[PDB]
Amino acid sequence: MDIAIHHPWIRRPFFPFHSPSRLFDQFFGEHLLESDLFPTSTSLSPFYLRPPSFLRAPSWFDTGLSEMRLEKDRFSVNLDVKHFSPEELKVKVLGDVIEVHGKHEERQDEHGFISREFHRKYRIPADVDPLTITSSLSSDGVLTVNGPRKQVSGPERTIPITREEKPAVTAAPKK
Amino acid sequence: MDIAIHHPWIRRPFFPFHSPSRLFDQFFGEHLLESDLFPTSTSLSPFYLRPPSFLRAPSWFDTGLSEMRLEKDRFSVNLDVKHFSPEELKVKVLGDVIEVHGKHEERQDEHGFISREFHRKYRIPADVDPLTITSSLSSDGVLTVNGPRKQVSGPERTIPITREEKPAVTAAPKK
Amino acid sequence: MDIAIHHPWIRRPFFPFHSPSRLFDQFFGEHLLESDLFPTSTSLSPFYLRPPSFLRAPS
Amino acid sequence: MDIAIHHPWIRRPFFPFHSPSRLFDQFFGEHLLESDLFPTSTSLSPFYLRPPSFLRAPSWFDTGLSEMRLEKDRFSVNLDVKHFSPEELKVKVLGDVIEVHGKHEERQDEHGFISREFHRKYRIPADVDPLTITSSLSSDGVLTVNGPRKQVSGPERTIPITREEKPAVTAAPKK
Amino acid sequence: MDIAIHHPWIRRPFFPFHSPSRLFDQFFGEHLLESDLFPTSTSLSPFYLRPPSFLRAPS
Amino acid sequence: MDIAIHHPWIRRPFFPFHSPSRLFDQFFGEHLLESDLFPTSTSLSPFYLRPPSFLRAPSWFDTGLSEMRLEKDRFSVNLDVKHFSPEELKVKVLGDVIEVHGKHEERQDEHGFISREFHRKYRIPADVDPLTITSSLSSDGVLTVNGPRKQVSGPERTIPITREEKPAVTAAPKK
Amino acid sequence: MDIAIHHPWIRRPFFPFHSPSRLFDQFFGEHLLESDLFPTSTSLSPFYLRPPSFLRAPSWFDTGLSEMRLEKDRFSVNLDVKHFSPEELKVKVLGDVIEVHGKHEERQDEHGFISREFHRKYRIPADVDPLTITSSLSSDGVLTVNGPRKQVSGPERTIPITREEKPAVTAAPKK
Amino acid sequence: MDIAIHHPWIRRPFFPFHSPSRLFDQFFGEHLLESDLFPTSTSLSPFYLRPPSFLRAPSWFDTGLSEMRLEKDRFSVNLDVKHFSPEELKVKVLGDVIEVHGKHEERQDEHGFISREFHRKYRIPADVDPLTITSSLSSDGVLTVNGPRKQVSGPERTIPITREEKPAVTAAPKK
Amino acid sequence: MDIAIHHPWIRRPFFPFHSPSRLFDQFFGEHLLESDLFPTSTSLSPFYLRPPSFLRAPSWFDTGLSEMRLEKDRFSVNLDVKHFSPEELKVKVLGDVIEVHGKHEERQDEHGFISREFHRKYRIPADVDPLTITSSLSSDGVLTVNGPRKQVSGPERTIPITREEKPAVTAAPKK
Amino acid sequence: MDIAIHHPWIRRPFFPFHSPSRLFDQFFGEHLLESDLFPTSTSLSPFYLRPPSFLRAPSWFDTGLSEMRLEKDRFSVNLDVKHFSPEELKVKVLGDVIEVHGKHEERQDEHGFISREFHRKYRIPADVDPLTITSSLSSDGVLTVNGPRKQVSGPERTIPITREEKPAVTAAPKK
Amino acid sequence: MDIAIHHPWIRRPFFPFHSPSRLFDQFFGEHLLESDLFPTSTSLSPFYLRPPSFLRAPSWFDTGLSEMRLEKDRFSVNLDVKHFSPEELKVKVLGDVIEVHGKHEERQDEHGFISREFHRKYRIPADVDPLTITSSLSSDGVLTVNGPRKQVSGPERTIPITREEKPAVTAAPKK
Amino acid sequence: MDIAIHHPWIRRPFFPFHSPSRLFDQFFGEHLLESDLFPTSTSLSPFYLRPPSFLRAPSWFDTGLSEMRLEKDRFSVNLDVKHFSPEELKVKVLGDVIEVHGKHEERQDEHGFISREFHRKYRIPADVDPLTITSSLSSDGVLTVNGPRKQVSGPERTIPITREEKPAVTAAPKK
Amino acid sequence: MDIAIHHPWIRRPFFPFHSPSRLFDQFFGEHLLESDLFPTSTSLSPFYLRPPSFLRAPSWFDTGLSEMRLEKDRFSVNLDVKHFSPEELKVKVLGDVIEVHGKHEERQDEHGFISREFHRKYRIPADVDPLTITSSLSSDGVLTVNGPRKQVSGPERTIPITREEKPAVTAAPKK
């Protein structure tokens, strides 16, 4: 880690960014928490956060967009099952997530039987809607989930519970 | 004091109170020091301090009152001296503090004499006034301090001295 | 009464803002006193007296 | 320095000087950096820094003046070379710094020759101007640099390079 | 010249606000420079020149 | 926990109890274990532990009566289910513990359905007997367990195992 | 003290006195405390502490006697004041303690005066009774505290107060 | 010797034997020392010690017996000397210990002579008696110690000296 | 303290003085103690200590003089009591030390009375002799101590006791 | 050891002896070594060492005398052998040391024979001279060594050998 | 280094030299510094120092002599240059040090040229004298420095500057 | 660098690469040193080193090639000097390295003159040959180094010196 | 032993000798152990060991020779006894080692007799043969051991025994 080299060297390509408030994570964090309460006369915002930029003319905002949808239209997605496995396949439409589980034994040996399995994991919200999206199987294994689309999803785990005004705790000297 | 338990636990029922300014003792301390100089446009204040409260409708202030007076009238307080001690008793009215010191030997043994003593300590400002408050003794020891009242007292020791405009010191490296 | 434990542990959190005088709660209190007793931002309102002094320039 | 004596004693005569903002070097440093950019509505300053003073009537500002010029006139400064050294002297006018280097052997011994040397270092900006200031030598060594003046100089090393705009650096955990 | 005493003792009080670059007195100074030379709050105050450059979009 | 204060102070209001056998937990523990084997001509006691008391006239014994039953008679206990949930409630009589689990959705929103639930935990041994104790439900949710009573219960976990005459182990030096 | 020498050596002659109960100070201490409560059919004794002795025929008991009285009769006693100091002497009979304080200036110099002083401290309870012991002075300084006698005294400081049945304290984990 | 495993495990099959007095080596040691002084109305005992046994019907006593004698008669023990060594053998009857030392050179080489030796160590007390036990040698080396017997022996080194009541030692504080 | 800088530097302007006997404090201390016993044919000194000097022609001796007397004659000293305080002033002539303690209340407030006090401490030996020096007070407070003078004083605390030929102590190894 | 007590206390009754040269063991050791070479102009001295004494009038010298001779005359010392042991006694005259070794069995038991022994160790140089001193035994065991005397002896072990002018060793840095 | 072996051993063949004054380097150093000032009544001395010797008859003095000159006469030293290098050689007579620097390429390869060089360093003061000593070269490289002689030289670096009477410098406590 | 994570994780993908000889750097280093001496029966090798590869059919060898030359022909390389600097430019052909140093002041200010400089560093061995490669300058600054080519270069610092077979050293125990 | 100097320096003149197998003591030790079993077609060797030499033409082998014999013939060695001691001399021929022990008192004093002794230790195997070598003494002490010779000897202690094929031990984890 060379604290005598990496520390002073790393702090080199950072001067022109320096002076960003020793408590940048809390300073801006408060301003972002204020605009997350009520539409503060802005051009609205799902979660746009005003970050420290060098752009003098335009005002940049931290956004997503390219993390929800991209290139879709109005067709039918098709899963992949190279070898037919009708009775040995299970298609599951768990929300905006289309998956296929097909296992078929095509390779055989003396006393050992080989079994191939194709499992697709599709997390296409803008292409899937459990309510309408159906499934159609072929005789070769070609699975095809047909139906409309338009939607956004994505299972995350960001739910900080607790802290809700009016608590209070206490302690005392010990040894 | 399990630092790996009491620390996160003592900070648990404190969340709804958290974010009270890491320097709460100095932040509010300054605002209270500003209103302690000149009677700022308020309902005045002997020492009312605006504290952080969850009350939304009303504005709470840190007060005293219940630490000065309570339930008193014309009155004529009475000291306690179960057994008479006319010559062996001394009543002292030191300010708003009425005290009685009476010692009488009522129990006797072979070569050992027992002496009982009754000492009362009354810190009743709203009941005593050195000037008018007098004392009347009975033949049974029943002492009675009669007289008007109305006033507050309480001997404390809170007088920070020095830090009297423009001082300055200096130092230098050593080892 | 942990003089060799609490004492050096209580003066530790003070370091982030420790270095000046030993007393920080009176100069600021008097500096604000002479500044709060003076019509600042708003209007005014005084009241005083004057006893004998040796000072010629001030009073 | 007994930390149990000097510490509480070096902070004592500091009593009413305290409360100068724990971050005084940065707080005022920012205000001085702001007035160092654009000529802010003031009586104009080269580097006047509004410092914390006890003066109530007048406003004090950190200034120089007594570190550039003082008492000068037409003049015609003259270096010092007690003993003549026409061929053994070199006068150098390096900017606002006039110097003389003359060495002459006046003392002689058996097999040892003594040599005297006179070296003057004049840093008079308000008395020297390399362009006009000339030099006139006498037969006794009396050097005389004649000419006009009016100027300020002084070699210092205060040029903190780096710390431009938009850099960006990073790191990562280690062990 | 206590390099093994003062050096690690002077960089200690900086930690409460230490982490970014080693140069913190010029980006904030230039950022304020480009913001102070611009009529903020008040209005007007210019004067400049223009030499040959390779830049086409800017100048 | 100032060992130089709490130790000599905590050892203060304990003098009058002091000298209670440095091995009080084992001394009396043996005498209590002897009377726990065979009714030792006592007034019969499940666990009357003769403790050290200051009572000179009467002999005190550690009891437990006030931890089994108290104010009961011959009626029916009523569970709590303010809102009816006939099909959505399940009453369970697990020994001397009567519980009710009823959940009904009475509050409705746009796309969110609220469901309230009432769960009672009754550990009344002197009021319950799995055999006779039945359950009757009302149309409002008022559950009522009817039947006689008289019994004592309470799930604990105090069952030391092993240590049964004739074991023997051994060891040897190491490094 | 060489732990590898003094320890095994100082524990050598101790053999014939060894095996004296590891808790000898408490074991015998209890038996001595039992006989200090009520005259336990003993030959009556203020503090006859039965100690471990090698005497097989007789039973030894720890006692005083030779620390209270010895050789006295009727007496008259005589203090010591070599040089007369009638007005400069003070005889004090503080209980069973007779003392004399006489100071007289017999030696003289130029500007320095010498003063000799004789101070006697008599702790004779067996021959002193403040109630009947008087004092007679001679013209030479010879003091004589005549009077009857027979008594015992001696100021000690062995009064272990506190601890007196029924106290109780407690504590809890710490860190 | 994992203290976190061997300690709790080596104490596992020890419970049914535990509770044997933390000072078992001294407790019983005293009772065995009391019966070692005078025949305490027992069936006598060379050194029979009453040990803690689970036997309920019979009383076990720690004894020897099988460490002194066993299977013998008139007898006439024979030493072993495979090869004759009349002049090169020495029989020694040191108490109840019969030994034979015979060395004869039977193997020969070029310039190296081999010498075999037979040494027997017989500690047979119940077979030997210095007085009567004699020795008879054969021409082949067969040694034969003939004679009666009946007696027990065995050289040990258990003789604790010193410690004899009366004497003692003392010490003082230092460091 | 920079042991690697201050040590070799503080030992820089010390060379030309170095080599003053590693035991200078004791070496010269003995020679000064020898001349402090009997007038050693010197010009009679009270405490003139011959110190090491660079003076080659004259012999320097450490002396006082300028620490006893200086500029006096034959007059009267005047104490300071700006405001009259006859009854509230106390002049004390404690040896060669003249002091004045006068306190008078000249400033008055509502319920607060101000009291000024003037206290002078004169340690003039060659200006005051308690035997003849008197005091004269004026109606304005001007105190004037009149009388002759000539004498030296000055309270110090340099009296090393003990150490007086023929003592002797001892010790022994420990651990 | 109480370094904070014994050190300053063991140095208390030592002052009047202090200043005995920090190197007293070597300083005087040299002067004693000088007078041990050649009979320096003195009243001679076997080993009289002039020590530091407080005696002002006389000069003290450390000597022996009372460690060689004492009270003897034309004698005939006699050893002690209470019980006769003519054949069981051995008298040895090893220089100025007369010893007797007599052992006789006078006490008899069943199978145990007791043997008493008398051993005398006489180190009388001024009473013994191996050359003339003889021995005479009596019938009761009374041994008597008769003969002249006058002599001094005493086996010691103080003989330093090494060191003898002209050696020289060396070394060098290591690590 | 075996401190428990080399220390007592390296001090073995050193005893006969021991006692050479613990401060031998300073004791004699002072006596040598005294004789280095003024030519003290002796057979003079360039730097002869009286050292501790075992020689009883003669007095030894530490001297040089065999470190300046030795065996020389009317000479004409010759430098060494096996192969001629007239244009490629440079003779230098720097004081009493004669040197020769000649480099000639005599060995040649394909594309690599070898160059041999002969460099002599003569520090002969008793053979060289910059003035007269000249140089003569031969056609084979044989250099010859001819001329008289007689002189002593030798560049050393023993010039301890500083310390020159009357400096003055001090310090103070720290922490 | 979590030793408890990175260590076992970094050796994880190393799984199928393990068993590469603990001393791989020396083992192969010897085989490569053997083929670096004499052209061992192979397709020769400039420095090809047979490394451990998974290739079964072909034999791989560590080589360079792509670190010397690449795409060249006849050529006439051109240096870069945007603005003419005939007199202010210096072309240097240091071996296979062609460089150009031209500085011209084209930008001018009030009292500040700007000077631009173009410096090219060409390390083209297969394009340069000091001998033939010349240089031509244009009036605009366009420099052009014309001439043939074909060559390889590259200044590195890999020359291990010394180990001149037949040395030897020694040491000894120390501390 | 500066590990930062001696380590890298003592490894410099080792450079050209390095790389002699990190396990040279065992590698060659094995090859020498193989040739020490059976005459491995060598030119027959007693203990010739092939060492790593730089000799390219000849093969060097570690040998003795110059440690057994040297320059002898027929001889008749003579011992040394300067002064005759016929009765006081003892010649011993212990193998190939001839020694003489003669002590005679030739110097006499007052009461002290001096005795000189001559002891010779000859370890000449190639000159002595205990079987034939005899001894002849002269009247002056000149001893002469005459006889043939030819033989080699020398007492050493190099006999590492045990390692009796088929051993093995075992252990186990502990703590």
Chain J residues with CB under 8 Å of M3 CB are: 175
- How distant, in Å, are the alpha carbons of A50, E38, E42, E50, M8 from that of A56? 14, 11, 19, 20, 61
Sign for the pseudo-dihedral over CA of H150, H156, H158, H159: positive
Domain region containing H104: 75-153
What's the number of CA atoms in the CB half-sphere (13 Å) around residue I49?
Answer: 13
Instruction: Determine whether the interchain pair C21/D16 forms a contact, defined as Cβ–Cβ distance below 8 Å.
Output: yes
- Nearest to F52, CA basis, from F10, F22, F26, F24: F24
Q: Measured between alpha carbons, how far is M61 from M55 in angstroms, rounded to an integer?
A: 11
Q: Chain C closest CA to E49's CA: distance in Å?
A: 43
- Nearest to C22, CA basis, from B156, D1, B161: B161
Residues 6+ apart with CB under 8 A from M166: none
Interface of D with B (CB under 8 A): 1, 6, 10-18, 54
Closest C-chain CA to I108: C51
The beta-strand segments (E) located in L36-169 are 78-79, 89-94, 97-108, 113-122, 136-137, 143-144
Token pair of L9 as six digits: 């994780």
Q: Measured between alpha carbons, how far is J91 from J120 in angstroms, rounded to an integer?
A: 10
Q: What is the CATH number of the domain that holds M85?
A: 2.60.40.790
CA dihedral L106, L107, L109, L111 (to 10 degrees): -50
Q: Chain E closest CA to I2's CA: distance in Å?
A: 6
Token pair of I154 as six digits: 């000055």
Which of K6, K9, K14 faces J167 most closely, judged by CB atoms? K14
In this structure, are residues L91 and L79 in contact, taking their beta carbons and an 8 Å threshold? yes
Which of G165, G169, G174 faces F13 most closely, judged by CB atoms? G169
- If phi over 0 gives left and psi between -120 and 50 gives alpha, with beta otherwise, what is residue J161? alpha
H or E stretch at H105: strand H97-108
Q: Is J119 annotated as a binding residue?
A: yes
Please tell me which chains touch L, using 3 or more CB pairs under 8 Å as the contact test.
Answer: D, E, J, K, M
Q: What is the DSSP letter of A61?
A: -
**Composition of chain C by helix, strand, coil, percent to 5:** 30, 0, 70
- Nearest to J154, CA basis, from J128, J119, J118: J128
Closest H-chain CA to I172: H174
- Nearest to L88, CA basis, from L113, L107, L109, L115: L115
Q: Chain H closest CA to J1's CA: distance in Å?
A: 4
Q: Which residues of H9-31 are buried (b: 16+ CB within 10 A; e: fewer)?
A: eeeeeebeeeeeeeeeeeebeee
- How distant, in Å, are the alpha carbons of L167, M20, M56, M60 from that of M53? 11, 11, 8, 7
The CA-to-CA distance between both ends of chain I, in Å, stands at 37
Q: In angstroms, how far is CA L12 from the centroid of its own chain?
A: 34
A97-108, strands of its sheet edge to edge = A89-94, A97-108, A113-122
> How many CB contacts within 8 angstroms connect chain C with chain F?
4
Chains M and J touch (3+ CB pairs under 8 A): yes
> How many CB contacts within 8 angstroms connect chain D with chain K?
4
Q: Measured between alpha carbons, how far is H142 from H144 in angstroms, rounded to an integer?
A: 7
Can you tell me whether residue K56 is helix, strand or coil? coil
Sign for the pseudo-dihedral over CA of C16, C18, C20, C24: positive
Tell me the resolution in Å: 20.0
Q: Measured between alpha carbons, how far is F107 from M157 in angstroms, rounded to an integer?
A: 104
Mark the binding-site residues of K for Zn(2+), compressed into ranges: 83, 104, 106, 111, 119
Mark the binding-site residues of I for Zn(2+), compressed into ranges: 83, 104, 106, 111, 119
Instruction: Determine whether the interchain pair H168/G12 forms a contact, defined as Cβ–Cβ distance below 8 Å.
Output: no
Mark the binding-site residues of L for Zn(2+), compressed into ranges: 83, 104, 106, 111, 119
Chain B residues with CB under 8 Å of K171 CB are: none
Chains H and E touch (3+ CB pairs under 8 A): no
Q: Chain J closest CA to L175's CA: distance in Å?
A: 4
Which of L167, L170, L175 faces M16 most closely, judged by CB atoms? L167
Beta bridge partners of F146: F76
Q: Chain C closest CA to D53's CA: distance in Å?
A: 11
Q: Measured between alpha carbons, how far is D146 from D144 in angstroms, rounded to an integer?
A: 6
CA dihedral A125, A126, A131, A136 (to 10 degrees): -100
In this structure, are residues I83 and I147 in contact, taking their beta carbons and an 8 Å threshold? no
Mark the binding-site residues of D, compressed into ranges: 83, 104, 106, 111, 119
Chain A residues with CB under 8 Å of B12 CB are: 162, 169
Q: What is the DSSP letter of L152?
A: -
Q: How was this model experimentally determined?
A: cryo-EM
Q: Measured between alpha carbons, how far is H14 from F167 in angstroms, rounded to an integer?
A: 5
Q: Measured between alpha carbons, how far is D18 from L147 in angstroms, rounded to an integer?
A: 78
The beta-strand segments (E) located in chain A are 76-77, 89-94, 97-108, 113-122, 136-137, 143-146
Place of tokens 């006894």: M81
In this structure, are residues G146 and G91 in contact, taking their beta carbons and an 8 Å threshold? no
Sign for the pseudo-dihedral over CA of C21, C26, C30, C33: positive
Can you tell me whether residue L29 is helix, strand or coil? helix
Q: Measured between alpha carbons, how far is G144 from G125 in angstroms, rounded to an integer?
A: 16
In this structure, are residues K128 and K97 in contact, taking their beta carbons and an 8 Å threshold? yes
In this structure, are residues J20 and J11 in contact, taking their beta carbons and an 8 Å threshold? no
Q: Chain K closest CA to I9's CA: distance in Å?
A: 9
Residues shown for chain D? 175
Instruction: Determine whether the interchain pair J16/I164 forms a contact, defined as Cβ–Cβ distance below 8 Å.
Output: yes
> CA-based angle B71:B77:B80, to the nearest 5?
125
Residues 6+ apart with CB under 8 A from J168: K13, K14, K16, K17
Chain G residues with CB under 8 Å of H34 CB are: none
Instruction: Determine whether the interchain pair E27/A12 forms a contact, defined as Cβ–Cβ distance below 8 Å.
Output: no
Q: Measured between alpha carbons, how far is B79 from B89 in angstroms, rounded to an integer?
A: 11
Q: Measured between alpha carbons, how far is I4 from M145 in angstroms, rounded to an integer?
A: 75
Q: Is A71 annotated as a binding residue?
A: no
H or E stretch at C12: none
Residues 6+ apart with CB under 8 A from H119: H99, H100, H101, H102
Chain A residues with CB under 8 Å of F5 CB are: none
The beta-strand segments (E) located in chain L are 78-79, 89-94, 97-108, 113-122, 136-137, 143-144
H or E stretch at M30: helix M24-34
Q: Chain F closest CA to H21's CA: distance in Å?
A: 12
Which of M10, M17, M54 faces L171 most closely, judged by CB atoms? M10
> How many CB contacts within 8 angstroms connect chain A with chain E?
42
